Design a protein around this ligand. Structure first.
Ligand code: HEM
Ligand code: HEM
Ligand code: HEM
Ligand code: HEM
Lengths: 141, 146, 146, 141
């Protein structure tokens, strides 16, 4: 769980991501839409082609929400409260799907920061994406 | 495990560049670090107490290479995973008692390791092909539990 | 889906007593109640807003019966699930886009409903046979995603 | 998540379980060992035969810990803190296994309280067993 050591790794790792959070969030969606095509189902209204401006715009929102969560590890439930309602009540996103996106975001971070993506940092980031996924599916069950 | 002949060609071309010991040792070590309950299967390997003990244990690297060499065999026999791994399917179910969910975790950790090692060559499309391969392997090892 | 001829006989004997509409409507309704994201596939059924709207919607009961009748067909063809559900496997992957994990949730909700209806006749051994059947069905519907 | 309505259903449902909690905990283990035999792996030192006294004794401990959790829904992490250490550090129980046991415990409650095991009560009890499973695997990741 998010232990102090995990909070320290996650803050340090996100400082290295720095200004690429939105570009990494866009790349992660892309790998998710190509590797796990059932996910494309929640985005009928998007142009999902490589480089669509919408995906790029949505990659920035996801990237900013992760940057917000990193700033409030002590209280993700209140920082992401509004996103729980949307994903649970409004979008009815199948929980398996947060796992696929988390996997795609770790893959993207491994591509771009190979030297910073150490085993201990990979373990803390997985716990973090798991905590964020739990808050977003909390309003369900 | 239902790929275009060009996707298959891209898959095989990357495997020509895979160092099975470096990638295998890293994939297995990261599994043991990231999903800690997986360490109970490897009691006999000795010190697995912290990331450094884990990434440097020679027993982890050698087992990672064996696991990866076997994976490389399913890559070279994509039209026949089910038969390539049947005997391996019975060892894991019968003797090791590994839950099949762990085959999927390892497949994904493998994908994250290929990304780390190939960087931008490990494109979104190449990653999508590899997700079909790791799922193809995870289901053929899981074929004897079913 | 790898059963003793006596386990198979116990499985079939229970199915002689299954009311497919009562059990099917209840299994599907409980799925929709207990795992709420499953309601997005059934937008066209109308009011699914609370447990009573859900358990009483005639659309839920009729679909539950169809799903259960089809399940009853895999029960009568345990030596051939894969072929019994191939066409159903493509509908769910291709047209419905249902994640395969939901097939496992429904199979388990079905088991909980059989327990509720048969009580102490639904022994631990009979439940173990049924877990092999629901997993056998969940994997044949999931056979075309793989 | 455990909303007040879920806490009210869980307390009411556990009052109906009353004194059979240990006998239901023993039956649930039995259905779990027969339906999902990989689980038998954590109990080499037990006699797992139908009616073993050990399984019956362990069914009582599990039943009592659930009865404790039902008394502390507002704070499961502190009430079950000691059980998190054991399952995560000492036993290294694969998290998939809490799901199988939760399923087996719901099956057992459906057998014995068919009239009380309503769809809304089944939904609250699932959320509860999920919360209890999360606390017990928290000390991992
Ligand atoms: C790390 C996990 C996630 C985070 C932080 C996240 C964050 C967000 C954010 C910040 C928004 C934008 C809301 C707005 O613009 O008001 C959003 C919208 C949305 N997300 Fe999530 N998301 C996550 C995972 C997912 C997953 C796994 C899916 C489905 C596969 C998904 C599907 C959607 C959809 C369909 C929308 C509405 C988009 C639109 O119509 O513009 N999200 N998400
Ligand atoms: C990609 C999926 C996997 C493949 C291809 C694979 C392949 C293999 C192979 C080739 C061996 C050597 C067997 C022998 O020569 O007797 C082996 C053994 C073993 N594997 Fe798997 N494996 C996989 C996943 C796993 C997972 C996820 C675990 C546990 C978390 C696991 C645990 C073990 C153990 C404990 C042994 C025996 C170790 C020993 O001999 O010291 N494997 N596996
Ligand atoms: C036990 C596993 C299942 C079986 C045997 C099964 C079987 C069936 C059958 C026989 C039909 C009728 C198809 C037709 O005649 O065109 C159907 C349709 C459908 N099923 Fe499945 N199903 C299963 C699981 C699921 C799950 C878990 C979901 C979603 C959560 C799902 C969603 C649907 C939908 C949305 C349709 C089309 C509905 C309509 O025609 O209004 N099914 N299924
Ligand atoms: C609802 C979930 C669970 C609860 C509340 C729970 C509770 C407990 C309790 C109260 C103990 C006794 C400790 C003592 O006597 O000091 C225990 C021990 C143990 N449990 Fe868990 N348990 C749960 C799930 C599991 C699962 C899923 C497994 C593995 C499949 C498991 C395996 C064990 C083992 C191996 C022990 C030690 C038993 C012995 O040697 O006597 N438990 N559990």
């Amino acid at each position: 769980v998010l232990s102090a050591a995990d909070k320290t790794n996650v803050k340090a790792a996100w400082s290295k991501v720095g200004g690429h959070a939105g570009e990494f969030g866009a790349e992660a969606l892309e790998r998710m839409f190509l590797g796990f095509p059932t996910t494309k189902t929640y985005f009928p209204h998007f142009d999902l082609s490589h480089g669509s401006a919408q995906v790029k715009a949505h990659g920035k929102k996801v990237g900013d929400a992760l940057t917000l969560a990193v700033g409030h590890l002590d209280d993700l439930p209140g920082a992401l409260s509004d996103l729980s309602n949307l994903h649970a009540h409004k979008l009815r996103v199948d929980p398996v799907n947060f796992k696929l996106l988390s996997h795609c975001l770790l893959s993207t971070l491994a591509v771009h920061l190979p030297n910073d993506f150490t085993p201990a940092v990979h373990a803390s980031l997985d716990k973090f994406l798991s905590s964020v996924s739990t808050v977003l599916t909390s309003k369900y069950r | 495990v239902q790929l275009s002949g060009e996707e298959k060609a891209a898959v095989l071309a990357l495997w020509d560049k895979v160092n099975e010991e470096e990638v295998g040792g890293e994939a297995l070590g990261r599994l043991l670090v990231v999903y800690p309950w997986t360490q109970r299967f490897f009691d006999s390997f000795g010190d697995l107490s912290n990331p450094g003990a884990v990434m440097g244990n020679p027993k982890v690297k050698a087992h990672g290479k064996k696991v990866l060499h076997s994976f490389g065999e399913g890559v070279h026999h994509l039209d026949n995973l089910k038969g390539t791994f049947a005997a391996l399917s019975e060892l894991h179910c019968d003797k090791l008692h590994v839950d099949p969910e762990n085959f999927r975790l390892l497949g994904n950790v493998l994908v994250v390791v290929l990304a780390r090692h190939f960087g931008k060559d490990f494109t979104p499309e190449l990653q999508a092909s590899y997700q079909k391969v790791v799922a193809g392997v995870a289901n053929a090892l899981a074929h004897k539990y079913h």
